Amino acid sequence: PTFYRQELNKTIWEVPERYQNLSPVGSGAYGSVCAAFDTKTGHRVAVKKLSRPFQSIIHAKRTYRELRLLKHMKHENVIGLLDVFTPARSLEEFNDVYLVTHLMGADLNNIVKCQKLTDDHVQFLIYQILRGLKYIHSADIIHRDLKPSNLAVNEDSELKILDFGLYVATRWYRAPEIMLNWMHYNQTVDIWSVGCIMAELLTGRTLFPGTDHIDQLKLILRLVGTPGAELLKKISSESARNYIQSLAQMPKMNFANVFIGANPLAVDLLEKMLVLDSDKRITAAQALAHAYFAQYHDPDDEPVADPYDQSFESRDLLIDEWKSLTYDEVISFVPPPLDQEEME
Ligand SMILES: Nc1nccc(-c2c(-c3ccc(F)cc3)ncn2C2CCNCC2)n1
Ligand SMILES: [Ca+2]
Ligand SMILES: [Ca+2]
Ligand SMILES: [Ca+2]
Ligand SMILES: [Ca+2]
Ligand SMILES: [Ca+2]
Ligand SMILES: [Cl-]
Ligand SMILES: [Cl-]
């Protein structure tokens, strides 16, 4: 392919002539993103240029991690790859990596902001998040920082999870076990986040808008009640445990009185998601079977992922080894068919 250069976001992008009309649409994880027109298929795409992908072993391994992850993800509610390219003609000059996916014009904050969503619409949005999470969780991949700005949405409210498995971030949607650095956690950290997202879609208000980690924990405990001693097991820091134990005891609120006027099935699902005990939190696959999603649920169209080999995560390799491995993954990429779906 012939490449061309264009300055975007104050830096030179070098992309195949196939991709035209590049225009910036914001930052992504470890890179920045432009919308583009794919002249081969007439489809709109998003191209992410990774920022300094091989500057250090930290960048180099995270570049490999992201490319491996995105090459594996093949689900309608999860960001995957249409293309990956580099202007380099050999490994020796390989220093830049561009990732291509279908263009999604918005994030979930653009949906929930200037509209009173209907309950049927909220169901569809949360259903899609859970379908994507069932898939990634089935490959032992967790998001850990799921939030509206990590949900890409198009003009028809079709949604994809992004930046899973990977500047001041909001902590308002993080699972308490993550926010507070608890010793053990599981895939249901992401279900807590779904509960906070869903609550906000139903009420139009952030569920736990804490000003710091302590204020956020206090807001959480006001809703769900103070935890038992069993939960202290999870917390290494004695001062943190002593603090939580020292709090005046609070009962769990009845969610029916918090989410006044919501579909009772929505309230019931929130009660199952917003539990402090992560071993008692509903899973994505269980939530998909909940009656709240009855009109959308379809067991034939809620697939799991092929096994994903993450053995590389435990390995320390040299920068040039990560770089060569990443180059191999760029070269071996097989673009998917344009049409991968059939009528049910
Ligand atoms: N507009 C749009 N459409 C699809 C994806 C993205 C995207 C990507 C991304 C990831 C992988 C890839 F291969 C290509 C792009 N990373 C962050 N974002 C956006 C997520 C919403 N806020 C703006 C940036 N942006
Ligand atoms: Ca990891
Ligand atoms: Ca169906
Ligand atoms: Ca088809
Ligand atoms: Ca379609
Ligand atoms: Ca069927
Ligand atoms: Cl967000
Ligand atoms: Cl701790």
CB of 100 shorter than 6 A to ligand 1:
yes
* DSSP per-residue codes, 20-89: EEEEEEEEETTEEEEEEEETTTTEEEEEEEESSTTSSHHHHHHHHHHHHHHHH---TTB---SEEE-S-S
CB of 153 shorter than 6 A to ligand 1:
no
Architecture of the structural domain at 106-293: Orthogonal Bundle (1.10)
**Mapping DSSP to helix (H, G, I), strand (E, B) and coil, where does residue 173 land?**
coil
Residue nearest atom 18 of ligand 1, based on CA coordinates: 28
Residue nearest atom 23 of ligand 1, based on CA coordinates: 26
Return the DSSP state at 335.
P
Tell how far the Cα of 344 is from the centroid of ligand 6, in angstroms: 5
Q: Strand pairing partners for 107?
A: 152
Return the closest-CA partner of residue 243 out of 174, 180, 192, 185: 180
Q: Which residues are catalytic?
A: 163
Length of the chain: 344
29 is in an annotated binding site: yes
Return the DSSP state at 142.
-
d(Cα 302, Cα 291) in Å, to the nearest integer? 16
d(Cα 193, Cα 82) in Å, to the nearest integer? 28
